[PDB]
Structure 1
Amino acid sequence: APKVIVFISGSCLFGAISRSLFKKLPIPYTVVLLILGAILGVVASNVPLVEEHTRDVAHMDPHVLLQIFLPVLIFESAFAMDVHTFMRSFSQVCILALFGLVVASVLTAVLAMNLFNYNWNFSEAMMFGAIMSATDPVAVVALLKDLGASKQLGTIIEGESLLNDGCAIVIFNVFMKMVFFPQLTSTVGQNVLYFLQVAVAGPLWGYAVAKVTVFFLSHIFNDALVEITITLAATYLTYYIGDIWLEVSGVLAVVVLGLIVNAEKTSISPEVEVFLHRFWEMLAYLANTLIFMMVGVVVTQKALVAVDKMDWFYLIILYLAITIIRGMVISLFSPILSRIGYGLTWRNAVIMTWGGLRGAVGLALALVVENLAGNDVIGSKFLFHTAGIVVLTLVINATTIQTLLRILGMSDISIPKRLAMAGAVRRIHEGQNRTLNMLKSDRFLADADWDIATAACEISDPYSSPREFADMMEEARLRMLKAEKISYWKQFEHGMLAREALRLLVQHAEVAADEKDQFILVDDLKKSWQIKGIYPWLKRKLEDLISLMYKICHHMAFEVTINIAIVLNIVPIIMEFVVQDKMQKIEDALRISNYVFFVIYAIEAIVKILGLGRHYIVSHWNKFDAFILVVALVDIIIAETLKVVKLFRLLRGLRMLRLTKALIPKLILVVNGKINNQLSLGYDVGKGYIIGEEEVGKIIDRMVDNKKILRELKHISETGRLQVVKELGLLQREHPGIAVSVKTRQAIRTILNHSRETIHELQGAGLLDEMEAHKLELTVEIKMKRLMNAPSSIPPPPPENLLKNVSWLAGDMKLIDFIKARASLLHFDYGEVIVREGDESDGLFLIVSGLVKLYGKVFEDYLTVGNVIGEMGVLTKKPRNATVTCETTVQVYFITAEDMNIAIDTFTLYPSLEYRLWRVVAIRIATPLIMEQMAFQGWTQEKVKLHLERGYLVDLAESHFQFNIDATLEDVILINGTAYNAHTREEIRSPCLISRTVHKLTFQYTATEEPRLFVVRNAE
């Protein structure tokens, strides 16, 4: 019967009681956990039956304590952090945590040597400083996350805490091995090698196991428990193998592994993501509870038996000096911290000074000092001072950080947030009153008690002249910015934006609102999609790096065969190196003449592919293959003459060139993936700003009342939208394959999201049960996770594949053959004119490469690859509306008007080419009208487009050129021509939306009119 089970369960129950009883009180639950542990240790010192149950956990080994509790705490601190804002302010976090921890450890060591009466040397004092300077604030970061603004302050406190804890355990391990467990001597070179080993191979081993774990998690579908156990086993194996087998600081390895796993959360399924968040929070909570209970028991059993009044005096002075030292560290790093991103205000410096809550990490390190010291008093003094500092920091700093956050003015609720919460409470109260008025008129719920129902449903407020022209301009700018923020949140909620693009767009909107008269700036938004860096240069240089018998060897198999030769050469390289370093059957005849010249070098690379002259001349890879062959023949005649330098030259040269030639395209794929991530973020930010400008241009007529202010706001919005559109087109031009890959991924994601919504609508309507809909949801989730492992660079389709993928051409095959037979690829250079504004209609222009500019007269737009120009001019036989000028080198497919008229006249099935072309231009001409009608109703662009997609053009000859508008038709849009309405009360000249007062339509049949009508109905 293990007593540790009883102690662990009792600690869990004590922690649950402590959190359930001290939630309302401002003091933390860990302090009363320490108090309960002290009481339990007093009882164990009195009663031996309790001593038998507390002995196995109180007198635990230091090594198993570290190896069990440290990976959980370090990995949860790394996993809980928002890694985007952590990497955004990584410079400040890194310099503050690293250099402040170093100088705080030095100052605390000097204080421990000068103030304390014990004759401590520098090693034990530096151990004391490394234990004292490790900070674990969780209440402070929870308070900063909950109380409104300064989210950057919360994440800089969290990142500083994580790196401070990691490097503090590193410094503590260095000095613990300096003073306690060995006392060995070494040279300066071994010290340099040990510093290199720790500080470099910590994060390198963590990065290696993190990439292996990410590759393992990215290839697991429809299995959650495997992913959870892989995360847990990867954390524990990383820490154990790094700390024990590799003699490497495993704390930094778990820091790096947790930060990378938190960075690559898209390789984990979202249900597994939220389970992993809750699971690691639970594991760290259990670890903190066990550490604090164990610390209390051992403090009142062993660390309190040698304590005098001078120890308490030194504890008080140590607390005051620790707070002063941390404040002076932040104050002396304030110029350098202000000179880099986000700066540091004096209020944030005061919060970071006072938010240094000591935690379970320093308690565990003092525990292993106390257990490692043995019967010496240094461990008892260490654990007493650490327990006192933890208690004092927790109590005093928690209560005073609540009242200090109140006093400094960083906890005041903003006026727009308070007004939004008041509006939410008002709409909830209105909805509850309507629900109660519905419920009182029920049959079954008619004699229920309504006083109790109203008292239960009482959710309440948690927060309890040119000068006129300037004021109206400020009001209009503020209303426009609020509408832009609302539009960005609407885009994110509808499954269009990512989280990072949403955060960047609302950050730009807020910092535009804080200034005097500026709007959201395009130039500040350019840095999102500025893909320039070392990665385009790396991709360019690597694509410059790689650029009879031949027909035998082109079957992509002999390179795989020589890669098998690469690994089968690499293994005896290490074997011969190790055995000849440590120096049977003369190395078994030297691996039987290294596999008999390695099957005479795979029959001399199949006799240099039987002597391909040009291929072996023009390639340098074959040149150092020939260098390998002459070097290996030289080593063969060296073995005939028999040095080891020649053998090692053979091994080294073989392995290095073979691995370089293999690893070049994988490096190309990695660079393409990083460019893909940057391009996805930039495209999401740009597209979100564009559709936000479209929505804020739609809804601006209700808000803005003046005319000059509305004109200036429209001009500013149009200039910003045009600049972002041209920038995104040029960015697509710079990296074509990456842009095709990110557009393909976004298209697949949108299609699968709409399919998931269709499955939800099927299961909510009762036509599909829970099990079959869960099977279909599992199928679409497997497809989404395999979409996350897409190729990062899909090669761009040829112009024929773009010609067969047009919306009005895609279904048919004979029509595709006709268009491909009668198209014409025309090339244009920079600055030339494709068409002119006053010219007659001549044909369509499918853009297959490059960017154009439509200077319609004002009307400006930039079209890219995959846009057809001139459908309306071809169909309606009107003259051209816009002049198209090239912005880059543009290749277009020009189908002439005669060929398109012939193709329209021939193909007359039920989906006809005339019907498809008119439906495409009807969607294009009816989307802004429906957007104008339902602008204030909150309908987005994509919902309007998908609502319009269910519509269809009516055949007026089927209904004798008269159309009735019932309530069965959701919306009716006239596309071309004139019309008359109702009892011929007026004439409908416009292509605008039909008003709801029209009950009937009448069309005549004139020359050059051909009237069309696009109707959308509800679910019939």
Structure 2
Amino acid sequence: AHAPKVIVFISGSCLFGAISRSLFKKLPIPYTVVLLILGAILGVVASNVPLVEEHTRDVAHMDPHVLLQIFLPVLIFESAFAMDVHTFMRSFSQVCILALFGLVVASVLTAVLAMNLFNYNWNFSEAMMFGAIMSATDPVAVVALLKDLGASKQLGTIIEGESLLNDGCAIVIFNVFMKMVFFPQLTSTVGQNVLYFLQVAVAGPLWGYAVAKVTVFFLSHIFNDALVEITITLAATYLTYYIGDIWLEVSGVLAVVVLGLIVNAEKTSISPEVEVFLHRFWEMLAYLANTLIFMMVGVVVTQKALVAVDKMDWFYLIILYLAITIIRGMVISLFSPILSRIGYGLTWRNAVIMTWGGLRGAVGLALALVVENLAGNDVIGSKFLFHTAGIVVLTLVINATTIQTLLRILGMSDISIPKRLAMAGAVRRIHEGQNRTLNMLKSDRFLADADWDIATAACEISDPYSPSPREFADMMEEARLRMLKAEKISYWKQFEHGMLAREALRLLVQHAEVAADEKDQFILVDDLKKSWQIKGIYPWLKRKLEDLISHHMAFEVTINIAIVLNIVPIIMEFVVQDKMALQKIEDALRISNYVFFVIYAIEAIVKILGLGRHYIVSHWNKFDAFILVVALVDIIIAETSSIKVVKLFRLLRGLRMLRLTKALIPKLILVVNGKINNQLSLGYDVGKGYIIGEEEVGKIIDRMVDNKKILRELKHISETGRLQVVKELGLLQREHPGIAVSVKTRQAIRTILNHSRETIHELQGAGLLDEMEAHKLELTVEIKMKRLMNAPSSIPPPPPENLLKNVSWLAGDMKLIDFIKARASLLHFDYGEVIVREGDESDGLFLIVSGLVKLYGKSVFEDYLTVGNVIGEMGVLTKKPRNATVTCETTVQVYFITAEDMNIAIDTFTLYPSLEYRLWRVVAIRIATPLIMEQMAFQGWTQEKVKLHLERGYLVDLAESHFQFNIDATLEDVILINGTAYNAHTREEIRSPCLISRTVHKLTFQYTATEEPRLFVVRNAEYN
């Protein structure tokens, strides 16, 4: 049988592909040409050696139904899967216009050329097949160069997407015309052609979308079963293609393209291991398909094609190559006016790169082989295959090689100075580390005899890339570029620790790089605003739907299931008895459906009774009664011509479905919630990342630039942008409560799980945890993380009493929570009201539970606070006039706790975690964060890292002595929160929130109660 033998041939193909790919890695030409040469050699051998001819012939000739039904789906799905879906979607308008219309025009022009130039005297359909074959490209070679050489990813994504779309459309057009050429059919009605177009073009993407959504849905509900995920993902593609193309007659390739794009986009629903495995697997399948196709082309072109090739054919091939290149260039130029004014916008040199990069690939050869096989013995098949192979060889020999030099000639090859400098710095750092380790290793007793001459040569890494106003302006530009670079660094740091998702980092870095190329330009809040600006369609849909949705626990699901049951007889009988108009089926159906209608009616009556006659007050109940009456009338008058019978079969058949829609509406609400959540999460991530980056860059810039004027101006710019962004973010919470709460909780759980994984890794590195149980714990962590993606899109906002239950200093003891609850008074305000003035006397605590408040006051401080923040916290502790004004921005609502009530609580709650201790720790962390930051800014720690580190610290009891001695061997950082302190030795006075210097071995204070000392310290991870 062929089953094992084809495996032998396929393995031989893999071996030849490996040889060609390896032995000529450093040569310019791609390995596919070598594969073609090997195939030609094998073909000529088989033509003269019957021994191997018998073996080869039985498998070399492949049926058209293995190429189209297997190879092409593999190639197309692999091409789609490896695509960066987000950038593709963001350029989709331009890429789709170009792909579709350019393909149509190019194929038409190529067909016209073929008809006019070639003496084959083909008809138009054959010429269209020819043009469709010649218009399919495969730039995988050029996209790699554009990816490696410089940050021109816009061009690479555009060209790859154009390749994908034109390949799909070329396959569709070829399928359409191949039928007219080789499987002629009777003249079709215009409506028939319209329906054919709808089936091929519209039904394909819809079928693919449906299957993709179902597949991702099921994937989201699989945990710790990587094998099942892989199997489902693989089976989905082939089932989609087969059902679409064979059974539904729908264009399979487009469905597969849509499935690939969707599955690639929804990467979060797939465990990362499965993601990488699938990527590699599909790449390998595409590689095998390419090698097989190329070798088959060589074999068959030598066997039976070149025998029917004349001198004029070579001239025709050369002319055709020139003509197709010129046609692609002309198409790009013709569409340039439109493309330039949408999406990225192609530059003059980008057009040349695209034109020259139009490499033809395996898809064209597969279609040519299909044509050749179908032709059988006509010259048309041989000529088609010869021309396609010639074009592919020419492109892979000329374009695929000269593209590298043309990149330089156009000036796109050079790597930018910033990347060169970064690479040089990294190389120098690596060399210094290598020198350190080399020096260290020579001390080992068990490595002293090492031949360092060899070691140095082996490990070394080489550089891969180897006061005047006119002066003040130069300084200003230099500082601007510096700050942009620092912002980029901060964004990357945030991402690497998981503070941000990949898309947010992409957007932020794109904006930062764009802002550099404009004079005196900085990242603008308005530019970022588009990220978190919710498209109005979905809010409009939610608002409209919520109106419509506005007797025990399951009396409605029962009727829903009843409709879900009886849809089947209604849909089936009235569209089956038309054919059948066996008997006992109708005998049962008649009375069974009649009694079904009766039971529904009686259940409606039961609920009318259990709820009273007011049941009919509801709007939808009126419709239910109406459909009940219609069914009653028709059935009863039947039980008492066709047109008085089809009033059931068509009309009532239609009406019975309608009342089911009242269950779909809630699900559509939940789906719109998911969409709005997906947008709002990205908006929040972008805004938060920008704010954090600005905060850090302010600290860094404080010391980076010496020029005081530039320092002041840049700090003003940064603060002005940050305040705008934070206010804009705050408004969103008011706009959509539930979705905001959902996103916030999601991110909180994500961060907690990330730190849990980090702790597990730390434990394993230390060895305290066994090398195996770590994987069990990490598995639990990973499944818990994946369960987040299924979290509800919206969560009802917690009531205020819960907000009091969760404040950091209250939460640890329900006796204190129930005490403070008994006295807290809820207050309300209007826009513009002032809660506290600067320098007024102390009244108590405010906990903000709704709305937004703006703070202003001398340290100069201007920022906004939102729900869950505590305000006035120092005024009950230090018994001092207020440090700032707080003004309401949007109908603020707050809990207030009076100074007397706090004094009583503090006097009455003095367990080990003293209430005063908790209150001072919450003040101390917020006051110390900036102090630690400004000292540690240059170093690696981020603000989140600084806060988490400080969290380990504690306040000193500071009652045994009014002098503190510091053990640097066990103490990491020392912060004086409040009080007056002085060094024991030098007696220098400290009377401010200050970071204690290292040299201070012993501190000293005074007994005066006018400023009670409060010292916060952080100890080493070890004891003491």
SS of the residue 1:304 aligns to:
helix
SS of the residue 2:308 aligns to:
coil
Distance (whole Å) between structure 1 residues aligned to residue 248 and residue 968 of structure 2: 79
Say which is worse superposed, 150-159 or 858-867, in terms of deviation. Answer: 858-867
Instruction: Pick closer, same or farther for the CA change 1:595–1:364 going to 2, 3 Å.
Output: farther
Q: Do the aligned residues in 2 keep the contact of 1:4 with 1:53 (CA within 8 Å)? A: no
Offset, 1:224: 1.1
* 1:59-82 superposed Cα distances (whole Å, 9 cap, x missing partner): 221112211112211111111000
Q: Do the aligned residues in 1 keep the contact of 2:673 with 2:794 (CA within 8 Å)? A: yes
Offset, 1:637: 2.2
Instruction: Pick closer, same or farther for the CA change 1:427–1:937 going to 2, 3 Å.
Output: same
Offset, 1:595: 5.4
Offset, 1:592: 2.4
Q: Do the aligned residues in 1 keep the contact of 2:624 with 2:659 (CA within 8 Å)? A: no
Offset, 1:677: 1.0
SS of the residue 1:539 aligns to:
helix
Q: State the superposition RMSD in angstroms.
A: 1.5
Offset, 1:122: 1.1
* 1:971-1007 superposed Cα distances (whole Å, 9 cap, x missing partner): 0001011012132521121211000000111222212
Offset, 1:1016: 0.1
Offset, 1:36: 0.7
Say which is worse superposed, 436-445 or 837-846, in terms of deviation. Answer: 837-846
Offset, 1:579: 1.3
SS of the residue 2:893 aligns to:
strand
Offset, 1:655: 4.3
Q: Which runs of 5+ in 1 are unaligned?
A: 548-553
Distance (whole Å) between structure 1 residues aligned to residue 707 and residue 979 of structure 2: 34
Q: Do the aligned residues in 2 keep the contact of 1:202 with 1:250 (CA within 8 Å)? A: yes
Offset, 1:496: 0.5
Distance (whole Å) between structure 2 residues aligned to residue 623 and residue 653 of structure 1: 17
* 1:14-69 superposed Cα distances (whole Å, 9 cap, x missing partner): 11111101211110011111111111111122222322332243222111221111
Offset, 1:2: 2.8
* 1:314-363 superposed Cα distances (whole Å, 9 cap, x missing partner): 11111111000000000000000011121111100001101111111111
Distance (whole Å) between structure 2 residues aligned to residue 458 and residue 597 of structure 1: 83
Distance (whole Å) between structure 2 residues aligned to residue 645 and residue 898 of structure 1: 81
Instruction: Pick closer, same or farther for the CA change 1:617–1:594 going to 2, 3 Å.
Output: closer
Instruction: Pick closer, same or farther for the CA change 1:438–1:582 going to 2, 3 Å.
Output: same
**Aligned with 1:299 (options 298, 301, 313):** 301
Offset, 1:643: 3.0
Q: Do the aligned residues in 2 keep the contact of 1:37 with 1:297 (CA within 8 Å)? A: yes
* 1:671-718 superposed Cα distances (whole Å, 9 cap, x missing partner): 111111111111111000000001101111221111111110110000
Distance (whole Å) between structure 2 residues aligned to residue 365 and residue 939 of structure 1: 57
Say which is worse superposed, 846-855 or 600-609, in terms of deviation. Answer: 600-609
Distance (whole Å) between structure 2 residues aligned to residue 567 and residue 33 of structure 1: 58
Instruction: Pick closer, same or farther for the CA change 1:611–1:814 going to 2, 3 Å.
Output: closer
Q: Do the aligned residues in 2 keep the contact of 1:6 with 1:53 (CA within 8 Å)? A: no
Q: Which runs of 5+ in 2 are unaligned?
A: none
Q: Do the aligned residues in 1 keep the contact of 2:336 with 2:346 (CA within 8 Å)? A: yes
Offset, 1:3: 2.1
Q: Is 2:213 the counterpart of 1:216?
A: no
Offset, 1:137: 0.9
Distance (whole Å) between structure 1 residues aligned to residue 594 and residue 217 of structure 2: 34
Identity of aligned residues (%): 100
Distance (whole Å) between structure 2 residues aligned to residue 865 and residue 735 of structure 1: 14
Offset, 1:441: 1.4
Distance (whole Å) between structure 1 residues aligned to residue 1017 and residue 1005 of structure 2: 15
Q: Do the aligned residues in 2 keep the contact of 1:11 with 1:290 (CA within 8 Å)? A: yes
Match of 1:523 in 2: 526
Distance (whole Å) between structure 2 residues aligned to residue 595 and residue 41 of structure 1: 72
Match of 2:344 in 1: 342
SS of the residue 2:849 aligns to:
strand
Say which is worse superposed, 351-360 or 43-52, in terms of deviation. Answer: 43-52
Offset, 1:962: 3.7
Offset, 1:852: 1.0
Offset, 1:169: 0.5
Instruction: Pick closer, same or farther for the CA change 1:834–1:653 going to 2, 3 Å.
Output: farther
SS of the residue 2:1018 aligns to:
strand
Instruction: Pick closer, same or farther for the CA change 1:969–1:595 going to 2, 3 Å.
Output: farther
SS of the residue 1:237 aligns to:
helix
Distance (whole Å) between structure 2 residues aligned to residue 279 and residue 350 of structure 1: 34
* 1:519-561 superposed Cα distances (whole Å, 9 cap, x missing partner): 11111010111113311111111112211xxxxxx43311111
Distance (whole Å) between structure 2 residues aligned to residue 339 and residue 390 of structure 1: 33
Instruction: Pick closer, same or farther for the CA change 1:898–1:262 going to 2, 3 Å.
Output: same
SS of the residue 1:822 aligns to:
coil
* 1:786-824 superposed Cα distances (whole Å, 9 cap, x missing partner): 112111111111111111111111121011111211111
SS of the residue 1:505 aligns to:
helix
Distance (whole Å) between structure 1 residues aligned to residue 656 and residue 286 of structure 2: 45
* 1:73-128 superposed Cα distances (whole Å, 9 cap, x missing partner): 11111110001100010000000000000111111111111111112111111111
Offset, 1:960: 5.8
Match of 1:825 in 2: 826
Say which is worse superposed, 55-64 or 943-952, in terms of deviation. Answer: 55-64
Distance (whole Å) between structure 2 residues aligned to residue 438 and residue 131 of structure 1: 63
Distance (whole Å) between structure 2 residues aligned to residue 659 and residue 23 of structure 1: 63
Q: Do the aligned residues in 1 keep the contact of 2:35 with 2:291 (CA within 8 Å)? A: yes
Q: Do the aligned residues in 1 keep the contact of 2:962 with 2:1006 (CA within 8 Å)? A: no
Q: Do the aligned residues in 2 keep the contact of 1:965 with 1:998 (CA within 8 Å)? A: no
* Total equivalences in the alignment: 1014
Q: Do the aligned residues in 2 keep the contact of 1:18 with 1:33 (CA within 8 Å)? A: yes
Q: Do the aligned residues in 2 keep the contact of 1:693 with 1:717 (CA within 8 Å)? A: yes
Q: Do the aligned residues in 2 keep the contact of 1:631 with 1:650 (CA within 8 Å)? A: no
Say which is worse superposed, 831-840 or 60-69, in terms of deviation. Answer: 831-840
Distance (whole Å) between structure 2 residues aligned to residue 405 and residue 613 of structure 1: 81
* 1:434-491 superposed Cα distances (whole Å, 9 cap, x missing partner): 1110111111111111111001011110010101110111111111111111111111
Say which is worse superposed, 586-595 or 719-728, in terms of deviation. Answer: 586-595
Distance (whole Å) between structure 2 residues aligned to residue 635 and residue 188 of structure 1: 40
Q: Do the aligned residues in 1 keep the contact of 2:106 with 2:131 (CA within 8 Å)? A: yes
SS of the residue 1:825 aligns to:
strand
Distance (whole Å) between structure 1 residues aligned to residue 553 and residue 267 of structure 2: 35
Offset, 1:586: 6.8
Q: Do the aligned residues in 1 keep the contact of 2:107 with 2:128 (CA within 8 Å)? A: yes
Q: Do the aligned residues in 1 keep the contact of 2:699 with 2:937 (CA within 8 Å)? A: yes
Distance (whole Å) between structure 2 residues aligned to residue 659 and residue 926 of structure 1: 60
Q: Do the aligned residues in 1 keep the contact of 2:627 with 2:656 (CA within 8 Å)? A: no
Distance (whole Å) between structure 1 residues aligned to residue 237 and residue 127 of structure 2: 31
Match of 1:314 in 2: 316
Q: Do the aligned residues in 1 keep the contact of 2:28 with 2:401 (CA within 8 Å)? A: yes
Offset, 1:968: 1.1
Instruction: Pick closer, same or farther for the CA change 1:124–1:664 going to 2, 3 Å.
Output: same
Q: Do the aligned residues in 2 keep the contact of 1:3 with 1:52 (CA within 8 Å)? A: no
Offset, 1:659: 3.4
Say which is worse superposed, 427-436 or 873-882, in terms of deviation. Answer: 873-882
Instruction: Pick closer, same or farther for the CA change 1:856–1:618 going to 2, 3 Å.
Output: farther
**Aligned with 2:987 (options 985, 988, 993):** 985
Q: Do the aligned residues in 2 keep the contact of 1:974 with 1:1013 (CA within 8 Å)? A: yes
Offset, 1:184: 2.7
Distance (whole Å) between structure 2 residues aligned to residue 646 and residue 608 of structure 1: 28
Instruction: Pick closer, same or farther for the CA change 1:602–1:266 going to 2, 3 Å.
Output: farther
Say which is worse superposed, 951-960 or 98-107, in terms of deviation. Answer: 951-960
Match of 2:1020 in 1: 1018
SS of the residue 2:835 aligns to:
coil
Say which is worse superposed, 49-58 or 155-164, in terms of deviation. Answer: 49-58
Instruction: Pick closer, same or farther for the CA change 1:221–1:959 going to 2, 3 Å.
Output: farther
Distance (whole Å) between structure 2 residues aligned to residue 362 and residue 280 of structure 1: 20
SS of the residue 1:885 aligns to:
strand
Q: Do the aligned residues in 2 keep the contact of 1:632 with 1:650 (CA within 8 Å)? A: no
* 1:736-756 superposed Cα distances (whole Å, 9 cap, x missing partner): 111111111110010000000
Distance (whole Å) between structure 1 residues aligned to residue 319 and residue 645 of structure 2: 65
Distance (whole Å) between structure 1 residues aligned to residue 822 and residue 987 of structure 2: 50
Offset, 1:961: 5.2
Instruction: Pick closer, same or farther for the CA change 1:4–1:974 going to 2, 3 Å.
Output: same
* 1:547-599 superposed Cα distances (whole Å, 9 cap, x missing partner): 1xxxxxx4331111111112111111222133123132371254424151345
SS of the residue 2:806 aligns to:
coil
Offset, 1:191: 0.8
